[PDB]
């Protein structure tokens, strides 16, 4: 039922899910002024030498690259974390003109898009259990501006195609995630919440401050996947984010500054 229209959007989520006004909901701008630069906050750890992805799906809401997590092969540790995480899927949130699409805002900029990489905390066993607790997930968020393409980016959009509607799904392995990152690991972070329905306050956000561009036409191309299944009204796959969100008695933290 829920989505992203005038009659099913996130303006409407809270009747379904009441914790859509809860207290550590996200996504929420990042003030960067008032950020506390925390000195003991470590560097991030990234270990996604070993990761494996297997399929892309147009789940309609947005896209997921899913990945092997069965075993520990890539992993989010470090920076606020105790403990280990491992990456589960990475799908994005865009919009239909470069200037929106992006969830978190920083001193209420919007960016063209957000990349989030999922990873569900190993204590927990498994990802459905990980979003039943606090502490349960860590989302790595990344902005993308439009200016020069990513190259690693490339292989994403142009399997697009085929699955451009609701629940389709292609193999795609040996996608490498590392080609997403931008050369900084510079983040804030702060406790929130999924930002789709169901909305479970179970997220560790950590959002690096450095955008990756991306560029005009791999941009555009995510604008020509559907919400829709096939055989229905076409119905662009845009506008695919929860604005920011009340920070209520949270504090972001920098690593940097
Ligand atoms: N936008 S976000 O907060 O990074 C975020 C987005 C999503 C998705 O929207 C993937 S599609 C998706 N569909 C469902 C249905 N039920 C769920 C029940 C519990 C948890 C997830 C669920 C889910 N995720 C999954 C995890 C995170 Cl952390
Ligand atoms: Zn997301």
Same mark, same amino acid.
């Given at each position: 039922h829920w989505g992203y229209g005038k009659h099913n959007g996130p303006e409407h989520w809270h009747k379904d899910?009441?914790?859509?006004?809860?207290?550590? #909901?996200?996504?929420?701008?990042?003030?960067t002024h008032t950020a506390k630069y925390d000195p003991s906050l470590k560097p991030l750890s990234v270990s996604y030498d070993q990761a494996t992805s297997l399929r892309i799906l147009n789940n309609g809401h947005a896209f997921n690259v899913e990945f092997?997590?069965?075993?520990?092969?890539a992993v989010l540790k470090g920076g606020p974390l105790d403990g280990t995480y491992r990456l589960i899927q990475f799908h994005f949130h865009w919009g239909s003109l470069d200037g929106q699409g992006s969830e978190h805002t920083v001193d209420k900029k919007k960016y063209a898009a957000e990349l989030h990489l999922v990873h569900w905390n190993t204590k927990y066993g498994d990802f459905g259990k990980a979003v039943? #607790?606090?502490?349960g997930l860590a989302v790595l968020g990344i902005f993308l501006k439009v200016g020069s393409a990513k190259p690693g980016l490339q292989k994403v959009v142009d399997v697009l195609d085929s699955i451009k509607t609701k629940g389709k799904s292609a193999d795609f392995t040996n996608?490498?995630?590392?080609?997403?990152?931008?050369?900084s690991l510079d983040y804030w972070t702060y406790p929130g919440s999924?930002?789709?329905?169901?909305?479970?306050?179970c997220v560790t956000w950590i959002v690096l401050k450095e955008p990756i561009s991306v560029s005009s036409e791999q941009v555009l191309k995510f604008r020509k996947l559907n919400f829709n299944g096939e055989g229905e009204p076409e119905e662009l796959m845009v506008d695919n984010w929860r604005p920011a969100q009340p920070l209520k008695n949270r504090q972001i933290k920098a690593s940097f500054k």
């Open positions: 899910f009441p914790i859509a006004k809860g207290e550590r #909901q996200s996504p929420v701008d990042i003030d092997d997590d069965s075993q520990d092969k039943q #607790q606090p502490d996608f490498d995630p590392r080609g997403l990152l931008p050369e999924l930002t789709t329905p169901p909305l479970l306050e």
